[PDB]
Design a protein around this ligand. Structure first.
Ligand SMILES: COC(=O)N[C@H](C(=O)NN(CCC[C@@](O)(Cc1ccccc1)C(=O)N[C@H]1c2ccccc2C[C@H]1O)Cc1ccc(Br)cc1)C(C)(C)C
Lengths: 99, 99
């Protein structure tokens, strides 16, 4: 589909059996979601944004579904103000910027 | 043009007669650039991101070129980690997300 930017580009994602609202963020290297449980191993990571850095948990090879499009990749979990879908997953669903 | 997201969507912008590199950011509501001088008066603004909030100076009706596309709008200046082109200007150049 084609999503305009008149409003924040929020979409529904399915992950870990839960449905959540997330922001398609072309300026985000990674994907980070608010506190939640995920299966498998994880390792700590520090990520920076405007405002400074926060500590998150990194889970690899996680299945996710964005607008019906399936993909797999690394998902970060931590004290983020909003759920963010980063480029690591946007590429997998074939998302591009056009103008 | 169509921009894929395998790499950061960094483009060249022109403001105050100078060229700078900036990140096309669909997750950012506003546009914030690293410290620089701009004309006119400014108003205070707090912008929140992943690590919290930062104080910035808000300049309105500023001329800025993005990938050759001319725009005139609000530009924030402050201690941002990278120059960010937000939706306020992405909408002016007619940018959309597609997949
Ligand atoms: C590895 O680094 C990364 O990729 N980090 C990402 C990141 O922060 N990228 N920055 C883009 C900004 C991302 C963001 O859209 C997220 C966001 C959206 C909506 C609500 C809250 C937060 C945001 O902060 N938006 C705010 C904003 C920005 C400008 C003007 C007005 C506003 C209001 C908000 O919309 C750029 C960057 C920062 C630090 C570093 Br070292 C490098 C690059 C990550 C993975 C942490 C999300």
């Amino acid at each position: 589909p084609q999503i305009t930017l008149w409003q924040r580009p929020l979409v529904t994602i399915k992950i870990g059996g839960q449905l959540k609202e997330a922001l398609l963020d072309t300026g985000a290297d990674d994907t980070v979601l608010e506190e939640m449980s995920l299966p498998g191993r994880w390792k700590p990571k520090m990520i920076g944004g405007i405002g400074g850095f926060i500590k998150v948990r990194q889970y690899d090879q996680i299945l996710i579904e964005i607008c019906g499009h399936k993909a797999i990749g690394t998902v970060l979990v931590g004290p983020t103000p909003v759920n963010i879908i980063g480029r690591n997953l946007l590429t997998q669903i074939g998302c591009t910027l056009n103008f």
